[model samples]
Each structure stands twice: as C-alpha cells, then as structure tokens.
Target: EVKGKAPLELASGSAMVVDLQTNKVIYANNADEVVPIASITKLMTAMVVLDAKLPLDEIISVDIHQTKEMKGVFSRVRVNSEISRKDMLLLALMSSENRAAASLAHHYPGGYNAFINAMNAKAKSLGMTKTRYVEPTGLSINNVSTARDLTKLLIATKQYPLIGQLSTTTEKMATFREPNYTLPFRNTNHLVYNDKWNIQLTKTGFTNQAGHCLAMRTVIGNRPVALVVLDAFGKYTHFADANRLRSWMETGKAAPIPGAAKSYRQQ
Candidate 1:
C-alpha cells in the first residue's frame, strides 16, 4: 500500500478527495459541513430526470413560471422557446443553466413538487443524510449539501453515461425554437477546456450564499479520484484548489495556501 501526505490546507470551506478504486478518502477537511451548493444541484436534477427514463426527445418549453422567483438569473433560451429534453439537460449540466434546470423539473410527470420528493428520496437511497434540495436550479440558498455526501453523489451520478458526457463537454451549440436560433453554451468548469487535467465529470457552481463550488471525478496517476469542494472564497479558487489537491496527491507536496502571498516569495 502507498501512503500520501495531505495538503496543509485548502481554500474551500469543506473538501474531500477520495480514491474511487478503493473507496477510501485520501484527504478531507470539514467534510461534513453542510453549505449551499449552488448550481452543483443540477447533478441531482440530471440523475432524477434520467432515472425516470423520461423521453429526451420530447420537446419542452421554458415557461415564465420557471424563472418566477429567481432574481438576476438569465437564460439564453428565451421564455416560451422550446427545445428537446436532451438539449435542456445538456445546457443544465454543461453550463449550469438555471432556467434549463427549471424547465426540466416543471415538465416532470408529477411536476416540481414530485421532483423535489424524488431528489430527497434519491439522496436518502444513496445514504446522503446531510444533503437536501428545495429546488432544481440550486439558485436558492436552501439547496445545500456536505462535501462527503457529494462524493457519494459523484459516484452515483457517474453511472449515467450521459451525465459524464454532458458535464465534461467543454462547449456546445444548442438549438431552440419559437424564435428559432442557435446559441453557443460553454462548460462552466474551465478545467474541462484545459488539456492538463483529465476530468471525466465536473460541475461548477456559485451564488452569494454558496460562494463557489465544484464537484468532479478525474484521473490522476491512473487512479480515479472523486473531489468535492464547497464554499470557496474566490471565483477561480475552486479550480485552483482542485489543481493544488491533484498536485499534492501526485507529488506528495503541498501547494502554497490561498491568500498567502508570502509563501510565494520563498519558493
């Protein structure tokens, strides 16, 4: 067996890195701290939608009610515009599109209420005791989870090949009807575009209450690793912290702590 040292610290309020091959945690800090997860909630939404075996080809329209209580949220897919369920899932997972997520739950067989019930039930089934979702978009601060619980989520969601494919997609061109136009959507997790990282699945999230968050499954040194970072202080710090953790695992060296400029001078 090989032993590795943990990073001295991480920028995220809570973090966990696990080796999926053995299902052993390689590193963890405040892994049980429950916090708003922001758009990371879409992973659950995608799983529930897929689990129901909903017809991805069915055309669904973005309703005005989907964005009713959301403030400052924007949608490239206009209200009343229609798109296939598969495209909606793509936009939601790839770009964390709030309206796209809303449209999906709104079109569910039992509507939003049942969708929320399904999400909680799925969480319980997975033994994620500290996770909860009050809405699909994750824009609400009420959508919260712990880092440890999310690692389980990462493992479960990976079973759906579509989740892995769509979440890791760096960019996509989606077609929408009503007005009839194409809009380019890009992955919110910038690491997918970086060739240096071997990310199989990833999701990025941010909100005033959630800070910045990320959930990912990636390969390092040929080992599948699951990582969950929540409530990072900066926009790019979550990605930076991920890279820091990766390097730490691969080389057994801790990176400089975030906001500590003095450490850079010595190196």
Candidate 2:
C-alpha cells in the first residue's frame, strides 16, 4: 500500500469509491448506511424525463403548484416563467436548482406523481435497492440512499450523453426568457471547474437533513472512478473526502491531517 500509514478521519458519514470499468470497490466507510441525499435526487429526475422521450422543445410555463414541493429551497427561475424542457433538465442537473427539478417532474406525462413512480422504477431497474425518492427534488428528508446505491446510480448515468455534458459543464448561460439575456448557471460541483480534475459527470447537493453531498463519475490518475460522499459534516468535507479518496486510490496515500488515523485497505 505504498508504505502509507493509514487513511484520514473523514468528516463524511458515508463514502465510497469504485473503478467504473471493473465495478470494483476501492474504499468504503459506512457505505451501506442509508441517509438523506438532498438535491442529488435530480440525477434520477433528469433520467426519468429523458426516458419518457418528452418533447425537449415543448414550452412549459412554470407551475406555481410545484413550487411548494421544494421545502425551503428557492430557485432564481421565477414562477409562471416559461422555459423549455431541455433547459429545465440542464438547470436541474447542473445547478441542483429545486424549482428546475420540480418543473421537470411537473411536466411529465401523468405529472409529478408519475415522474416519481418512474424514478423509483428506474432505481429498482438499476438495482439500487436501498434508494428511494418521495419527490423529484431532494429537499424532502425522505429522499435517501446509501453511498453504495449512489455509485450504482452514477454508473447508470454514463449511458446518457446529455447527462454527462450537462452535469460536468463548468458554466452555462441559460436564457430564461425569449427577449432577455442569458442568466448564468454554474456547476454545483466545484471540482468540475478545476483544470486539474477530469470529472465527466457529477452532482452536488445540500439540505438541513442531508449534509453536503457529492456524487461523481470522473477519472483520477487515469482510472475511471465513480464516487459518492454523503452527509459530510461541513460544506467542504465532501470535496476533502473526494481528494482523499483519489490520493488513496492512485498512490495509497491518505491525507495527512491532525488526528487522522483510520486503516485504509487497498484490495
């Protein structure tokens, strides 16, 4: 294991890393524990909408009813505003915008209920047995999954080219209104903006119930890695755990921090 001492004591309550090609787990801690997942729910929301093969260009006015679906989260995209399904999906996946996700589910064939049904079905089909979604937007504490299940979800995400593009896009200028200029929507995963990282897909989320969370499909030191950090104790803990996992994966080195002393097995 490169003669490293041990793994660092991470702040995340659950974490996991897997090689995408072999589906081999590189590291895990509390990985099977289920917990709230916040806006990470949007990943399934985007997939369900895409599976329906709905008209991407269809004009759907923001329904005020769905606004209440998001508990305390707010989106810059105003109510009664009109936007295309494509833009809504992109905004949901990229920015973790609660309203954008709700809008996607609202416009589904049988509406939000049907959209959620599809989400659960999709999770089951992907073999995400521990995952469950009460709503498209993860503002609800009921939206929960284990880190293991999330890696499965992230792996399934690779099948969608648009999801890869939208989730990893550094920054985008989305036109909310026809006549107005495009408003900026930045990627929620800060790592995607870093030139040093080769992130192909990612989604970041937060809520009072679901601490800071991140799910990613990226290449680290030339390895196709799928990772998830859930319920990190602080705003940056998820990112810190990500880098720690990367270092451990490539070089068998855990981050050297004060009080860090956890055994990391590389097998």
Candidate 3:
C-alpha cells in the first residue's frame, strides 16, 4: 500500500476489486495470481470453525500443543486458563491471537489435526481450488491464498453474521470469568475503526514472509465491493493502497477492465 498517486500500481503480488452488486470485476492487477497472504489466512479458519455449530459457552483448557504451537505468537489468553469458546474466538478475530486459534483447534472434540483437515476441506467445498491452509492461525508460512480465491471466499463467508461482526469489532474482551484476568482486545486492522469509511467486514494479515494483506467488504460506487490486497511492503502499504484505489474508484475513472472476469452476479 505504498503511497504515491491515485491508483498506484502494486509493486508486487495481486489485487482485485469486485462489484458485489453486479458481480463484475471493476478492476484487477494479476487478480488470479496466488501469493502468500500471511494472517489474512485466519478468515478461512474462522469460517470453518463457526460452521461446526459447536457450543461457544463451553470452557476448554489450553493444552501443551496449543502452548508449544503458539510460541512465536503473542497471547492475551494465557496458558492453562479455562476459556469459553466465544472468548477464544473473540481473541482470535480481534487480537489475531494465535494461541486462541490453536486452542480452539486443539480443543475441538477430534483434536487439532482433525481441525486442520476440516480447514482444508472447507476450502475445497468453497471452490477455492487455489487456496490452502497448513496451520489454523496463519502462524506457518505454509498458509497461502490467491487474491481471486480469497475474494470468492469472503463473498461466500460474509453471509455469516458473527464472522462479519467479529472481524469489524474494533474493541472487545475475552476473559476467564471465573478468574477474570480481564483479557481485553482491539481490532487488529485499524482501518475498520475509521468512521470515514463504511466497512461491512474486514480482516488484516501479515508475517515477514507474507507482507501486509487486507480484505474488506465496503461501499464503492454505491455497490458493496469485496477488496483483496496482498503482499504490500510497509505498515501503511495496505492502507495506502486502499486510499488510492478508493480514490480512483470514487472517480469512476479506472481504465475499462477489458477482460476482467465477473466474480459476483446479482441473484
């Protein structure tokens, strides 16, 4: 999201802005190219877990595997605390707390390995043929997705109310009510907080390997668009890119996308 001029070309990676209302591809730059998306990978994880109909009030202990797997990630939910499934998810979506995600997968009745399997299967079921998930938390560099595939994923997944709710929440707390460590959290993506924009849903992701990535559903040309931007270089790269892209989109002046594929169609 490097800032320079309106509609700045991405230095690298892929991007796409799909008109959700008409299912038209208004703009794209290598939109189908697959690339490492870092933490943006969690949206899929959150998707699969929520589809299970598992009880959110149940308390689960953070186990050895969750502890060991979450080493490099910062944890607001401490080890050995009994955490509600709802709170765990809150930490995951809002804080991008890796341990919370691992804890959820680990505590799934069949175990973490089985949860990873569901993640992969969910991707396939969603027609994300180019997408793959190797870890639940986007902790592994193995997680990867194409901008096109992710836009499709988001379009399909955004139907879930809680997914949109949690992703857009700027602040929340997930804590052990028994002990009440006060595990408060805030949105990992700050742009969602800006009243200047109307974000229906949003997710932010990054790792040194993946760079900055942002996916959001918002208004452009009075049509809701699911915007996918990946592999930007700086802290502001994703934001910078969004600003420029939005400016160009607002002007209705992007060069006609002669061959852009329709990603959504009005039902």
Rank order (by lDDT, best first): 1, 2, 3
**Which candidate gets the maximum lDDT versus the true structure?**
1
Order of models, best TM-score first: 1, 2, 3
lDDT per residue (tens digit) for residues 184-249 in model 3: 688877777777688877888887865788898888557788888887655666776677677676
* Per-model TM values vs. the true structure: 0.92, 0.89, 0.85
* Clash totals in order: 0, 0, 2
Worst 10 residues of 1 by lDDT: 258-267
Q: Which ten residues in a row have the lowest lDDT in candidate 2?
A: 258-267
Residue 160 alpha-carbon offset, candidate 1, angstroms: 1.0
- Expressed as tens digits, the lDDT of each residue in 178-205 for candidate 1 is 9899999999877887887998889988
**Cα-based lDDT for every prediction:** 0.86, 0.81, 0.73
Instruction: Write one digit per residue (lDDT tens) for candidate 2, span 1-267.
Output: 447636545657788889998999877888999898988898899899889999989887665375455545556777767778888888888888778888888888897778888999999999899999988888788888999999999989888878878888777788766335467998878788778788888998887765788998889887899989887766687898888887766667677532321222121
